[PDB]
Curated annotation (Swiss-Prot), chains A, B:
Keywords assigned: Aminoacyl-tRNA synthetase, ATP-binding, Cytoplasm, Ligase, Magnesium, Metal-binding, Nucleotide-binding, Protein biosynthesis
InterPro entries the record matches: Aa-tRNA-synt_II, aa-tRNA-synth_II, aa-tRNA-synth_II/BPL/LPL, Lys-tRNA-ligase_II, Lys-tRNA-ligase_II_bac/euk, Lys-tRNA-ligase_II_N, Lys-tRNA-synth_II_C, NA-bd_OB-fold
Organism: Escherichia coli (strain K12)
Binding note for cofactor: Binds 3 Mg(2+) ions per subunit.
Name of one Pfam family that matches: tRNA_anti-codon
Organism superkingdom: Bacteria
Cellular component terms per the entry's GO annotation: cytoplasm; cytosol; membrane
Full protein name: Lysine--tRNA ligase
GO MF annotation list: ATP binding; ligase activity; lysine-tRNA ligase activity; magnesium ion binding; protein homodimerization activity; tRNA binding
Residues that hold Mg(2+) 1 according to the record: 393, 400
Cofactor: Mg(2+)
Protein's gene: lysS
Quaternary data: Homodimer.
Binding site for Mg(2+) 2: 400
Length: 469, 469
């Protein structure tokens, strides 16, 4: 509506005026109370004690609602911790400000107010203002559902949903850090640019060294070098980059890899559990957490299932014996509607079948273990049965939330596998110097946040998701 | 020496053997004590109580020193928390392991040992081993001063200096986080890739959006959008990228920008103080900290000086009146050996003079304030005297450690300045929606770490500095 176009005319003019009058953008006002502080400490006292205590306060915020009742007014201010009602009254206020100023201010303006606190007829706490003034002139007025992403600030002003999501995103991160730190872990910062990296790479170039670098897709190898070097309990929460498309998938998401010496994946499985269950318990309180059509329960121990067990559980009609023989597995793959490429060996047919049949039903928090060697990266072969490897994938809401291994510290085998998929020479060399047996944890922070704040898209948890120009 | 080349022959063979015998890389051994734990809880008990308490322990680590006294041996193991002595004795140990195994292991091998703890003749705590075994075979032997950077793991194994530096680097970071969090701050994660950025840019390309992105040199603008949006106290400790050369200057260093609404640079100056003084106090204990030829004192309040004051203090012969007039300042610049380029106006000549004359002598922790408008970025002009701006630079050891402003929240002025140095349209738009008066803090984490661990080069504080290929 062209309504807003006049708003730009008026407000822009009002400011050219403020420049004539004084400092247009004063930075000298200092508050001392935020809505929530006031609420949590005064919300339960009737007028009486307020009248006695005579507690005067100072607040600052943005002007959301203004009800001009002639010579008295009710304005509601919004700061970082919520909303507080202000009683603006011409005679209690300095002379000439209520009419020649307050009334010429707009909604959206950043104001400061000092006065005695009380409560009105309808029951809301308010501040009888003996002082009130404009701090910043809002040149523009207050605010598909993608604009909510293009100008997150506008979003954070409007939606309490978002401001709560993000406020909690932080609460979670610092939560993870301290939980790990309690268990003798040390966070570390490794390179973001490597010279050697299954995903696409953000390739860049260094000027003063004419050498093409890569944005990390994971800090796995650098972290293990630290274990070799002796830091036996380290982790790193930070950005990883995957050069693909933005699936409302984000080009740069936050991951947490952590490593622990003298332990195996099972020990991480148990750590992962206690992590999710302590964060939900301290940050959200309820052990069951509503998430869309479903309710997630971190109260009861997570489900533990091998990939073999999973397939049988969700495709009950599978005569398992068929999976132990290539041809019967090929036919079990096809009859479920699976395009069996020529290269695929028993291990991939089966894992693929798991993906089709049971991955999506893993709604409750669940660990799937024993993945075939084939479909495995630098996966540590199981001693008793080398057909499978010592790794687990963590699942919540049908999504991959976690990862975990018993790290392959067998240099010669590692090396063979690098050449296998074609190679960090220095890594192998590091292994050759000796990496203690170690377990590695992998966690997608973003998805964990979604499953804790109820968000149902990654964009709802990244303050500035990449937008298509 | 070709000595090491045989080591590769022997050790590599020994392993081909271990494969014949069993699991070459067992991941089933579990310890339960680390050197330091043992030390800090047993270092002060004479043999007697050990003999009574009969405390049995389990440790794992790397084999540093082995003294083979025929049928008894003294091995010193190195884990994450230090060194513990082990008493390996053939008869107390299982049959056939002391001779057919222990003696065939090399230094550098990762071992596990279980036994009762005691103390020897020379006074060191030790573990009489009833169990001992090889966990990982060190295929390669134990370790200019740049190799210390090329294979940091080797470095961390050898130098206790480094292992202490880094252990503390962490201690500092988490220290900063909690200090800020105590003062109602919320950490946040903003983009690493922007479409628009005085330094050189790491330019990359996105595939699925044929648009060239830039690695951030600072998250300033994204952080302020959050203040506009209402997060009035936020900060972000993370990587920034400057595409220049690696001056033993690192292509990717860690920075901390934080913003606080309803406050000015002076409030940050005081925050910066309490930050450095509380971290040094809790993390290092001593309020004075030795650093090279000099002793840094965080005990006595930092020095506060304007750029004007600084110049007079270190170039006492400057008749200040000369700086208030271009020509006398041009001549004062030249006679100090300064190449006055044709574009330079009074403001830059002077600031430049400060750089030459007094920056390097700022050894004790010092704040320099009131920088000319000219040499200033999007700097908020001072109301009383607009010739200067409301910003400060923090200095320690002659280095720029900090930064601080009273943020320019004047959209029209901001915009003028973007076009001035040529421009984020959306930023200005954000400002137009209203940014409360706010103060911004800038800190180079790496340098702060150097000045806390005694390190004298950035490479000494970055686990994997960029190396020239």
């Amino acid at each position: 509506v062209v309504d807003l176009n006049n708003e730009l005319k008026t407000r822009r003019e009002k400011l050219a005026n403020l420049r004539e009058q004084g400092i247009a953008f004063p930075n000298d006002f200092r508050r001392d109370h935020t809505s929530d502080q006031l609420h949590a400490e005064f919300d339960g006292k009737e007028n009486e004690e307020l009248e006695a205590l005579n507690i005067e306060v100072a607040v600052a915020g943005r002007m959301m609602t203004r009800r001009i009742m002639g010579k008295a007014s009710f304005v509601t201010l919004q700061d970082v911790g919520g909303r507080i009602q202000l009683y603006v009254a011409r005679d209690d206020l300095p002379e000439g400000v209520y009419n020649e100023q307050f009334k010429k201010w707009d909604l959206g303006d950043i104001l400061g107010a000092k006065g005695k606190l009380f409560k009105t007829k309808t029951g809301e706490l308010s501040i009888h203002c003996t002082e009130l003034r404009l701090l910043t002139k809002a040149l523009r007025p207050l605010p598909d559902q993608e604009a909510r992403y293009r100008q997150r600030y506008l979003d954070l002003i409007s939606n309490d949903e978002s401001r709560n999501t993000f406020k909690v995103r932080s609460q979670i991160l610092s939560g993870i850090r301290q939980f790990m730190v309690n268990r003798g872990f040390m966070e570390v910062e490794t390179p973001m640019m490597q010279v050697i990296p299954a995903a696409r790479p953000f390739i860049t170039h260094h000027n003063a060294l004419d050498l093409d670098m890569y944005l990390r897709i994971a800090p796995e190898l650098y972290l293990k070098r630290l274990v070799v070097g002796g830091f036996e309990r380290v982790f790193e929460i930070n950005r990883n980059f995957r050069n693909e498309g933005i699936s409302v998938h984000n080009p740069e998401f936050t991951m947490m890899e952590l490593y622990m010496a003298y332990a195996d994946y099972k020990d991480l499985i148990e750590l992962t559990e206690s992590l999710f269950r302590t964060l939900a318990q301290d940050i959200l309180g309820k052990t069951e957490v509503t998430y869309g059509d479903v309710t997630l329960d971190f109260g009861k121990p997570f489900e533990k299932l091998t990939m073999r067990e999973a397939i049988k559980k969700y495709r009950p009609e599978t005569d398992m014996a068929d999976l132990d023989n290539f041809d019967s597995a090929k036919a079990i793959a096809e009859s479920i509607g699976i395009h069996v490429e020529k290269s695929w060996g028993l291990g991939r047919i089966v894992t693929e079948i798991f993906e089709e049949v049971a991955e999506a039903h893993l709604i409750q928090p669940t660990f799937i273990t024993e993945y075939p060697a084939e479909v495995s990266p630098l996966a540590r072969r199981n001693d008793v049965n080398p057909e499978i490897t010592d790794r687990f994938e963590f699942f919540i809401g049908g999504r991959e939330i976690g990862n975990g291994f018993s790290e392959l510290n067998d240099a010669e085998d590692q090396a063979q596998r690098f050449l296998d998929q074609v190679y960090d020479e220095d890594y192998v060399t590091a292994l050759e110097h000796g990496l203690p047996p170690t377990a590695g944890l992998g966690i997608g922070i973003d998805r964990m946040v979604m499953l804790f704040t109820n968000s149902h898209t990654i964009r709802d948890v990244i303050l500035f998701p990449a937008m298509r120009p």
